[PDB]
């Protein structure tokens, strides 16, 4: 993996679902940081 | 200071934002990869079974 | 003033929840059609080929 | 495309999802006009 | 009364924000399971049809 | 159904996305009592 198209699709996906995680993350510090 | 607080809640959820614009396009990829695949199955794979 | 700030965040956060609920129910039907999928393949296909 | 009631289902996936990314706009909107 | 308010939208956020995690997980969860399901077609269905 | 692993996973989908609407349920209830 991956071994043709079909599966760097669907390693783009991950790599989205990263990028939300990350930008949650970022949203969470900032609120953390709230009073 | 509250005008602080009220501006790191608009940076905190303009980020929220870019997470779920972020989803909805992994969604998207994904969504086509499933019509890909019920495409290959109906017209790669049943003709030839 | 600021009040209106507090009040354009509400309406905004309750957008984009609106955002999240939608795109969970693509996510749910997405879910849907690739156990579909799976279903075909085992009960359709296998058992002719 | 559509052919069947699985491709209209994968189209109403499509829809969900462009209608989640219009309520981001909105609230993205909503958020550049805050001070 | 306002840093109440403020503070509301603060909770309301971080639900927001676990809404979303939640909702990546699952659709990792279904990512990994269309994987499965093309390498199971090829290595499992197209090698005996 | 749940017939197997995979049917177990889906089922898992299933539950994270009922986690993420019951997540958007109280953030909608938490601001309708925002003035
Ligand atoms: C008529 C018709 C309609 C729809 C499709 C699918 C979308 C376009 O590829 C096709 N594809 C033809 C088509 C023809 C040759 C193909 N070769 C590959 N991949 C390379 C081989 C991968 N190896 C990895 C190891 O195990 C054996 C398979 N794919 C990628 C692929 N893609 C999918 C979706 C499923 C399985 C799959 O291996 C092909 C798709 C054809
Ligand atoms: C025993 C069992 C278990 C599960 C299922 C899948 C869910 C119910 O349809 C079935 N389906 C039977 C079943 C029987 C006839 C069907 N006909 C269609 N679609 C119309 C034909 C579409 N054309 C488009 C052009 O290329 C050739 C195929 N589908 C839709 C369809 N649906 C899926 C999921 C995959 C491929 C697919 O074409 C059928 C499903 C049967
Ligand atoms: C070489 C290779 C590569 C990839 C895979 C898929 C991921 C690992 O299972 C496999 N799986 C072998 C493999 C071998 C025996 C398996 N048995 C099951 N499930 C139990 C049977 C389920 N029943 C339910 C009723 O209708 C008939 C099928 N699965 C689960 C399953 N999983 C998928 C993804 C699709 C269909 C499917 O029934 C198997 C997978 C093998």
Known sequence: ?35 | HLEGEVNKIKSALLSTNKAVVSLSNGVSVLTSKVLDLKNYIDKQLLPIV
Do not use: C, G, T, Y
Request: proline letters at 3%; hydrophobic letters at 35%; zero cysteines.
């Open chain 1, 1 to 35: 993996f991956p071994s043709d198209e079909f599966d760097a699709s669907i390693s783009q996906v991950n790599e989205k679902i990263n990028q939300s995680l990350a930008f949650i993350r970022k949203s969470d510090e900032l609120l953390h940081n709230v009073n």
